[model samples]
Target chain A: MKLFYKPGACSLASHITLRESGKDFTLVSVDLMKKRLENGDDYFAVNPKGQVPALLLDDGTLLTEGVAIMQYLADSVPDRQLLAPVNSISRYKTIEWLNYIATELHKGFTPLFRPDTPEEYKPTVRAQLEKKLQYVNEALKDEHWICGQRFTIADAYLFTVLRWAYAVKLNLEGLEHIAAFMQRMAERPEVQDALSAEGLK
Target chain B: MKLFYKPGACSLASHITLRESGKDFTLVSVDLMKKRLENGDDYFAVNPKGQVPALLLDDGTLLTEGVAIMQYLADSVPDRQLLAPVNSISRYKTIEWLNYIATELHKGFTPLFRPDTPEEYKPTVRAQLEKKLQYVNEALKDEHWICGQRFTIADAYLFTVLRWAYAVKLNLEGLEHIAAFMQRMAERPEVQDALSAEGLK
Candidate 1:
């Protein structure tokens, strides 16, 4: 198996999940800005969308989308319990977190990073993101993890996007539960390994 | 089962899935603008996020997020195969479509709908969405559905967002495949039922 990623990108969640899955896979860094691989190969040929977190399976089929890839990794090793089983309500609830982070938190940050975004609009974008962070902070206040107790793939995904809040210097003030959650996530060996591999550490 | 939704909202995807699931469900429309139920109850009390497409299970537990709701409804009746089973490449592939539509298509239109979005940026936002629609048009050119045969939740999602394109009047002149795909979706009995229930027909 192989995972194509950009260091510190949202793909980090998939990298972290790969470590948690105990699966054997190689990492290939992508230069998203140039749309090229480390070896100067055209990335568009690898994945037409030219995005990261594309998992090249042993069967030669590629799975894109970090959310789907994380679920695939988790389900591949059910004993690891990275995600719940098919019929379990716990499974969909965890997915609820995944979808939330992907659409709300992740995409919420897009305009701020895009060069095409108008200068006059960035503050509004930034402020909206800050509001979302506060919402996440409140949700984290009472739970040990986002879903409570199990450090499933949801933690990997949340931790990945939260790092962006710090990188982009969003208002982290008084979001103590989020700060604590970040600390807990940092303590995970799998997260550390993924970070070190991505040169984020 | 009870589905809390607003007519013609992204929740329509979940509403369509519920019909496709062949499950017994009642619709409770929420006025998202006012955050109220049809009976004037606080929407936030039912879903803290105050979003539609909240599936209230028979056990009284509420499930939010249209994507998650669609997945849960699909998994509830594997016989309908609205989604593929876990561990199947087909499953993740379908999810790839789901995530792509959620982030790139659905959320891509968010700023245009926001009252605070600067007037200067609407053009940029509209252009970006047009490019994404072209991508979708190209993808649909050869497939009977987003994932090939047997309409899945991905189609439900794509159809819901494409409706917004027409509502906002983004150019669809040359995207013949998308137009055909939309017509195909409009013909589904489940889709028709959901549209009628939402009064979108």
Candidate 2:
């Protein structure tokens, strides 16, 4: 598998999941703004969506969307327990977190990053994101991970976007649990490797 | 199962899924702006997030997030095949649409719905949404469903949000494939039942 990524972008979640799956995959850095690959090729030719985290499977199937890619990688290595099997309530619950993080947290950051976004609306976006972070902090207060007892695919995603919260200078002052969760995520070897692989740290 | 929903909202996707799943479930209308139930009970007491599409299981477990709830309901009835089983590439491909709808199409509509969004930014939001809709329209041109030959949860979501596109008056001119797709979705008995149950039609 070849995972196309943009350093420290949402693609990091898929990269982390790929690492956790113990799968052999190569990474290609994408200049998302230009839709160019490291080799100066048009990314649109690879994934018409011009998005990162597009996983080109050995079968030559290109999967675009990070959430889908993460789940695919995790479920492929069920013995790794990255995600629970289907029909398990735990698996859907994990999916719940994945969707929440994708829509509420991840997409929430878009307006703040996009050059086309009006400055007047940025405060509204940031305030909304901080409010969500507070809610997530409350949820993570006494929990080992986002979904269940172990680190599931949700953790990789939550951790990926939380890093963005700090990078964007969103209010993390009172989000103690989130701060602790970040520390926990940073301690994992796979997390470190993924981050290092992306030159994020 | 009991589904807490606000009529014509994103919850409609879950409602549609539940109807198709052939599951015994009750619908509780929620006044999301006030977070109140039809009986005037506090919705937050039942689900802390106070979000619609919260599914209350027979076992007293509450599952929130429309995507997660839809998947759970779909997986429970494999014969109906709302979503394919795990390890099936088709399933993740379906999931790819689910995430795209959730983040790009669904979340893209958020700013337009929120009164707090700046007037200056409304143009940007509308333009971005229109571009995405055009993309979706193009993809639907030759496809029976969003992902595969069979109708899946992704169609329900796409149909739900496309309704909002019309309601909000975003330019849908020339998106004939999406219009055809919406008509096909409306033709489903389960969809008709869900819309009727929600007082949407």
Candidate 3:
């Protein structure tokens, strides 16, 4: 399998999952600005959405969407237990976090990143994100991972998006739990490898 | 099961799915602006994030996030096949559409609805959404549903978000496939029932 990604983007979550799954996979970086692969291949032919984290399977089938790709990768190597089995209530609980991160945390940053976003609206967007971060911080308190002790895909996705908070400079002053969560994630060798491979280290 | 929702909101997707599942459930309307239930109870008490489409199970567990709730409800009734079984690649394909709608189509409307959104920024958001809609239209052109033959949860979600196109008045001029898709969904008894129950009919 080959995963097309942009360094330190949401694709990092999928990259981290690939390594954590202990599976063999290759990574291909995309120049999102140009929507081309490192070799100047038209990414539009690969993914019409022109987004990172598109996973091309051995059968030549491509899977886009980081949440979907993350879950698929985890399910492929169930022994690693990166995610719970489908029938388990724990599995949906993990998805709950994934959906929250995608909508509230992930998409919330879209406007701030877009150059066309109005200057005045920037603070409102930042304030809303900061408030959500506080909520996440509260949830992270007393938990080793997003879902109890196991480092599931939700953690991978959460850690990926939280990195952006620092880049955008959202206030992390009182978010000790979140800070610790980031620190814990970075301690994993797979995360370090994924980060280094993407030139984000 | 009891679903907390607002009439014609994204919660309608879950509402439609609940009816399609052939399951027993109740609906509780929410006044989103006031964040209160029909009985004037605090919405935050039910869901800390105060979002609609919160599912309260018979066991007293509350599941928030429409995507999570939709999947949970679908999985609960495997006989109905509201969604593909967990192990099927089809399941992830369906999820791919769900995530796309949640982040790209659903959250894409947030700025337009917010009164404080800058007037100039509206067109950028609208153009981005229209382009996505065209992609969706192209996808729908050859298939009966988003995930092909089956009328899965993704369709319910797509229909819910697509309704906003007409409400927010985005140009849907030449998207013949999306128009037909919406018309077909409206033909379903469950869709009609869900709409009427929410006072949208």
Candidate 4:
């Protein structure tokens, strides 16, 4: 399997998961800004949406979307428990967190990354993030990880997005649990390898 | 299985899928604005995220998130094929459309729903929607549905969101493919049943 990635993007989750699952995969860097793959292939042709973390299969089948990408990786290596068991509500719960991180936390922070995004809209986006953080903090209050004791793949994705707190300029002050979550995520050897490969560690 | 929904939201997709899958399930409404179920139960306790389309399983497990909810309904009835095959690239393609509809098409129009969103943001959002629609139109030009021959759950979701296009005054003027796609979705018998049950038809 080959994973196409833009360094330090949400693809970091997939990168970390590949390592955590102890899988053998080739990494292909995508120059998102130039919209080209390292081999000068048009990236949009691989993914019409022009997003990173496109996992190319042996038959050249490509899978985009972070949630599906992570699930596919987790399922391939069942012993990793990167995801909960299939047919269990706990599995759905893990997916629920992945979707939450995608829609609420991941997409919510999208504005800050776009130059066309209005400067005035930043405050509203920040306020929305603060509210979401408070909710996430509440969820994380009783458990050390996002989904109880097991460090499922959801944590990998959330940890990737939480790193944006500093870049997106979200006020992380007093977000004790989330801040602590960030620290633990950084210390993970898998996460470190992924980030270091991207020159972000 | 039971589906908690508000008329005309993403939940309609799951509701439509349940019917398409030939499953007998209860359809209950939740007043999202009031945050109460039809029985006046505190909806928040069921889903802290407070989103509609919350699915209550026979085992009393609560599942939220439109993507997760739809996957559960489809996996519970594999014969229906609401989702593409698990390891198939088309499955991920379907999910790609789902994610696009959620973050790009659905959330893109969110500001118009917020009265406090300010008038200036609408045009920018409209531009974003236009770019996304252009891509969708091009992607769907040669196909009947987003994921080729089969009318998977992604169409149900896209239709539900496109139903809001007119409501939000999105001018889908030249997007003939999306127009044709929406018509294909509305023509489904399962979709007809779900909409009527929601008192929308």
Candidate 5:
């Protein structure tokens, strides 16, 4: 397995999931802005979308989407508890969180990242993000992780995007439960390794 | 199972899935603009987010999010083939479409629906929708359905959302493959019944 990533991007979620499953894989860094790897490989050949977090399976198939990649890596070692087991209701619960986090919070940060987006789009995006974060914070109010009592891969994905709120200057500092949750995810050895691998402190 | 829906909302996707599954479910109409039900029940009591498409599980646990509800309904009926089998790679492929439709296409269309969303936001939303529709149209170029070969729940969802494009004057008519796919989904007896049941015809 190999993960093509750009440090500090959403690719970090796949990187962390890979670490959590203790999967042996090489990391290939992509310069997202330049659309090239350090060795000058065209990233488009890997993902035409020209994005990060493209996972090249050992079978040589390429997976482009982050949520899809995360689930694949987690399922590779089901007993790791990184993902709920197949055919179980708990599994769908993890998936629900993954889809929500991707659509709600992940894409919600789009306007803040892309300068070409109209100025008027900012407030709606920001307002939606705030409302979503508050809702998530309340959902996490008494839970250690998103899927019941276990710290599944969904938390890793959420924690990765939560890191972006700061760069965008979107205030999640006041989302107390999520703030505490972030701290816990930060201390996980696997998550810390992903942060370090991505050059984040 | 009880599906709480508002005509023309994303819940239409869930309702379509139920009909496709040949399952019996009580459909409760929701007055979203008024945020109430015909029975005069408070909407928030059903979904704190006040969104339509809340599915009341037989056990009475209410599932609110569309993607979540879609997966639950699909999994509940093993013979329906509404989605790929559990843990199959195709299942994730189906989910990728659901997540994309919800985030990129679903929310992307929000601005046009909002009368107060300033005039400037329209272009950004339009461009985003076109980009995503391009992807969807291209994905369907080589196949009959979003997940390929099978007309899984993802197609039901894609059809439901694409139908809205016509009303919003979304310019999707130019996408030949998607238009044909929508027509295929609409021709089904189950789909026609579901539409008539909701008074859409």
Candidate 6:
């Protein structure tokens, strides 16, 4: 499998998941700004969505969307326990976290990054994100991971976006649990390996 | 199962899935503007996020997030095949659609609905959404559903958000495929049932 990624983007979540799943995969870097591969091929020809973190399977099929990619990786190695199994409510709970992180946290940062976004509106975006981060911090107050007890794919996704929170300089004051969660994630060898592989370090 | 919903919200995706799943379920309405149930109970007590489409299981388990809720309902009755089975590549392909609709189409509408969004930025948001809708329109050009051949949960989701384009008045003119897709969705008995259930019709 070849995982197409842009350094430290949401792709980091799938990279971390790939490492933790003990799966053999190659990483292909994409210049998202230019929308091209290292070889200067039009990235749109590869994945028409013009996004990163697309997984190309051995069957020559491509999978886009980080939530789908992470879940695919975790399901392929269920014994690794990267996610709870199919019949468990715990699995959907973890998925709940994935959706929340994707829509609320990940997409929340889009306007802030876009050059087209009006400067006056950015504070509203940032304030809303900070508020959601507070909710995340509260949810993490007593748990080791986002879904509690297990180091599921949801944690990897959350950890990916939380890094953006710091990068964008969102106010992190009073989010102690989130800070601790980031600390815990940084200690995971797979996360370090994925970060290193992406040259994010 | 009991589904918490608001009329024509993204929750309608899960509501449509519920109707299509051929499962017994009850619908409970919530006034999202007020963030309270009809019974006047605190909504946050049921879901900390206070989002619509929270499903209550017979075992007293609460499942929030429309994406996750739709998958759980589909998985509960595989014979109905609302989604492909776990082992099939078709399943992840379907998920690819779900995640895309959730982030791109659904969350894309957030700023348009927000009173806090700057007037200058609304056009940018609307244009970006219109572009993505064109992409969705292109994808559906030759396909019967989002995933093709079968009506999966992804179609339910895409149908849900596409309705918003019309409601928000985002210039759907000449997007013939999307117009056809919406018409196709409107013809489904399950879709009609769900729309009527939510008092959207």
Clashes of each: 0, 0, 0, 0, 0, 0
Best by DockQ: 2
In the range A39-128, model 5's lDDT, one tens digit per residue, is 999988888878888888787877778887887777768678787765677877787788778877887787678877778767877877
Task: Give model 2's DockQ, 2 decimals.
Answer: 0.92
Better of 3 and 4 by DockQ: 3
Query: Whole-model lDDT, candidate 2?
Result: 0.90
- Residue pairs with colliding backbones in model 2 are none
Q: Tell me the deviation in Å of residue B201 in model 4.
A: 3.7
Model 5: pairs clashing at backbone N, Cα or C within 3 Å: none
lDDT of 6 by residue, B1-201 (tens): 888888888899988888888879888888787789989988888887888989999999999989999889999898998888876899999998999999988998988888998888888889999999889888988858888888899999998888888888999988898988888999999899888878887
Please provide, for model 6 over A125-187, each residue's C-alpha lDDT reduced to its tens digit, 9 standing for 90 to 100. Answer: 898998899999999998599988879999999999999899988889989999999999999
lDDT of 1 by residue, A114-196 (tens): 88888888898789889888889998987589998888999999999999889989888999999999999999998999999
Order of quality (DockQ): 2, 1, 6, 3, 4, 5
lDDT for residue A190 in candidate 1, whole number 0-100: 87
Candidate 2: stretches off by over 4 Å: none
Note the DockQ of each predicted structure: 0.86, 0.92, 0.74, 0.57, 0.50, 0.83
Candidate 4: deviation at residue B177, Å?
A: 2.4
Give candidate 6 misplaced runs (Cα > 4 Å). Answer: none
CA RMSD of each candidate after superposition:
1.2, 1.1, 1.1, 2.2, 2.0, 1.2
TM-score of chain A of 4: 0.94
Across B1-201, the per-residue lDDT of candidate 1 in tens digits comes to 899988888999988888888989898989989999999999999999888779999999898888889998899899888899998889998998999999889999988888998898889889989988999999898859999988999999999999999999999999999999999998898899888888886
Tell me the tens digit of each residue's lDDT in model 4 across A1-201.
888898778899989998999878988898888889888899888887888878887877777777778887887777888887656778888888888898889898888787777778878888998899888877887547899888999999999888887776777777788877788788889889888888995
lDDT of each candidate versus the true structure: 0.90, 0.90, 0.91, 0.83, 0.81, 0.89
User: Looking at candidate 3, what is the lDDT of residue B85?
Assistant: 77
Docking class of 6: high
Q: How does candidate 1 fare on TM-score?
A: 0.98
User: What would you estimate as the lDDT of candidate 4?
Assistant: 0.83
Candidate number with the higher lDDT (3 or 4):
3
